[PDB]
Every structure is written in structure tokens, then in C-alpha cells.
Write a protein that binds this ligand. Sequence first.
Ligand SMILES: [Zn+2]
Length: 440
Amino acid sequence: SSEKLFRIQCGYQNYDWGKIGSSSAVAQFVHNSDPSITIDETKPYAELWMGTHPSVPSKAIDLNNQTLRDLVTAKPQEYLGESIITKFGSSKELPFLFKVLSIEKVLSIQAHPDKKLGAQLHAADPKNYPDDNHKPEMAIAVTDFEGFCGFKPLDQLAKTLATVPELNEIIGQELVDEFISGIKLPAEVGSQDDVNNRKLLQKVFGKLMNTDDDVIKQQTAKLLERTDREPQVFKDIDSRLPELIQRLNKQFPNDIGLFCGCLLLNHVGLNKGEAMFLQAKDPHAYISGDIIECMAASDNVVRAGFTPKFKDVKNLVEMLTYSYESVEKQKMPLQEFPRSKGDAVKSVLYDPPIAEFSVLQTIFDKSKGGKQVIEGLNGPSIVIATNGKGTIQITGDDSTKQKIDTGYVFFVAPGSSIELTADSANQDQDFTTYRAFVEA
Ligand SMILES: [Zn+2]
């Protein structure tokens, strides 16, 4: 067995919003990795955790069933490397958490502080703000995905305000008026028109979010009747909207999220392989699908809807950036990755503008197959195969050559070069892997 490249059996969570049983990628992955585990066709399999989180350990099946957190702790310079220990200040764990999510029901509409606000919140409200940190997140579609991300373009918001009586009602004709009159559209970031546009958005949002519950309850009922009686009004805004409203109301009846999610945020569809970065102080929600998720260790969340939990409206309204870019702008650009070479038809770097993590996407054509060699990286890595099957090894050392099937996950030590080959015989799917890493 190698201590440089080794397989880990990862734990999972059965949260009630997860896809049920084997319809869930989490379930599929868990099962394939350890068929010993019989999937309960009745239960939700929400998340697969990969890393050094104390609550849900990843066990080194070949290294005596030891915990990755344990191995790391035991040998930090070997598993983390100097530069990482130094940079993040830990010797016990990874600076990121890597997961698979299998979403059946919408999660909360939420935003995360930057480090500066994170420390502020933590000092003032430790009960709601567990840590001191920011919480960058990145989502990559495994299966087709839907979510909310950012405010819609202002012109879309003006159309919504003028056209949807129930919203118009809540905001107030004076305010609607002011908004629709006020916004300076061909306007670029940092301009006085950009600034004043955000002030207008903030007023509108604040008015909505401070509305009493009773009113929300009333207005949401009316909204649903309208989706039913006059679908065209909604379709004129976005062809998916009326059915989205109806779907989410079935999950969270008369929730404010029907307003502040469905009417104010971009409804983003990610094709498999596409990504979105969830920056600080930007509203978003996961609606449905199977994704790869990477994030920093924080628990700091400010919630706006689709939740039973505490909604800190005060902080919410003041912290947002009130950015209003397109749905198209919500998706990450493809980056090249010089330190990988070979036959893969897709070898893409997803580099968020934060330090804690990066992801490398490697895809082989099911037909073409082939090999890819990746240089040794200056930090720890976790590799998961989401589709197809192949082999993984330390470049040039065939004694390390192992099976990597769908759902298999590996730890790769800093400095180890990896060679991937796509299953010669098996050509069902494109052999697809995701590697989460960090370099200082
Ligand atoms: Zn989030």
C-alpha cells in the first residue's frame, strides 16, 4: 500500500432535502465505493463529505482504516507540506471541505460574510456566527443543476415590479416609481450611476425583507393564484418562472423566498461540467441537482428564505453588494492547466479568486480513452471519479496502479505526480474526475 496515493471511504449525511435512495449520486457513489453498504431506498442521501472534518471522517481503507484527519495530524509536513501549515495555520486538517450534494428540495436563500464582516458578526453574535471566517463556496454540476445566484439585471427587475401586482403592492407605488425612474442602466462598476443603482436596489430589497409575515402570507397566496390564472405574465419575464414558483411553494408554502428568490434573483441552470463561484455578500440558493461543492471551513451563513432557521434581516440588508450581473455572468470561465498533459478532451482549471482551494476537471472521451499525466502539486489533493472508470497511479510506478471507478475517492500527497488512464474496455461514459487542491 502507498501512503502517497490511497483510497478513502467517505461518510455521508441523510438530510431530509437529499435525493431519495439510489436516485441520489451520493447513494450511487457510496455504494459503488463500498457495496458492503446497502442503500435504504427510503431515505435521503444528501451529502458525501471528503476531507478532515471531525464530524464525518474519511477512512484510509488500505492504511488500516485510519482517518485522514488522523494521518494528517500524525504527519503534517508530508500530508500538508510546510507552506500549507504556515499559510493556513493548521497541522491537523485541510483548509477546504469537499463534498458531493444531491439536492431534492431547495436549500435556504443565503449569503456569507467576507473575513472583515465575519469577525464583526462573530464578536457581536456568537450564537448565530460560530466562527470568524469568510465562507467562499464553488458548485460544479455533476448532473443538471438549478440554483439562484445574484440579483437580476435591473431592467428585468423594473419589468417585474411594473408587471407583478403582488410585488408592486408590497414595495409601494412611490418606491416602485423611484426605482424604475432612477436606475441608470448602461452604467459600469464603480460609477456614480452604479452606486446610485445599488442604493435603489437596496431600498427595494429592504422594503421587501422588512414586510410582516402576515402580509407575506397573504401576498404569496395571491401570487400563486396569479401564476395559475395568468401564466403568460410570468413567462414574459422568464419561461421557467410560473412553474418554478409553483414547485417551490409546494416545498415551502407561502415563504418569502417566493418573492425574494423567485422574483429578485437569477434562476441559473448549470449543465454538467459547468461551475459557479459563490462570492461573499451575494445571495444564492441551491434548488435541485447533483453537484460537486468546495468551500472554506466556516459555518457563517446569513439566511433570507426557504428556511425554518433564524433569518438575520438586519445584517442581510446591510451586507449585500447589490451586484446585478446576468445569468451568464454567474458561471465560471474555463482556465487552462499547464501542469497536466495528455489525451483528455477537457482539462480545466476552476480557479476562484480565493486562497483555500482550486479544482481541476479532467475528462476523457469514452471512445478515445487515453492517458493524462499531472505534475506533482505543492499541496494536498482529493480526487473523485463522478463518471466512467479508469486507473490511477503515481507516474512511472506501476506498483501503485489502482482501479478508480465511479464514486471512488483518493488522497494525493503534495509533490506526487499522477497518471490517469481511461478504461480501455468500458466505454459507457466519459471517464471524469474532479481534483480539489490547494497551493500556497
Ligand atoms: Zn452558500
